[PDB]
């Protein structure tokens, strides 16, 4: 004799696709710190692109 036992198999597909502004997070929309941040490297593009 046999049987059927349907079972659940759960698989993640998509973690919540987050996006973080490069300079809004780091600088609170100011004038001197924005220039100081751009004085750093191309991290605004790097992090946002990743």
């Amino acid at each position: 004799n046999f049987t059927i036992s349907v079972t659940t198999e759960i698989l993640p597909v998509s973690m919540t696709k987050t996006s973080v502004d490069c300079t809004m997070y780091i600088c609170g929309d100011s004038t001197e710190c924005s220039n100081l941040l751009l004085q750093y490297g191309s991290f605004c593009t790097q992090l946002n692109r990743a």
Binding site: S19, D21, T23, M24, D29, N48
Partner: protein, 50 residues
């Protein structure tokens, strides 16, 4: 699709507010004073609400 920049909306005027008092702080006479406290016993002066 390309996220170019942020959208930080500029302010439209300025607002300043303060304690609604007109008292002055007794500073000038302290420097003018010939009478003066000691150093091994320096004086304290709780200036407030002015």
């Amino acid at each position: 699709i390309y996220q170019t920049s942020n959208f930080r909306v500029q302010p439209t005027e300025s607002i300043v507010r303060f304690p609604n008092i007109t008292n002055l702080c007794p500073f000038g006479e302290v420097f003018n004073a010939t009478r003066f406290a000691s150093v091994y016993a320096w004086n304290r002066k709780r200036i407030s609400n002015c």
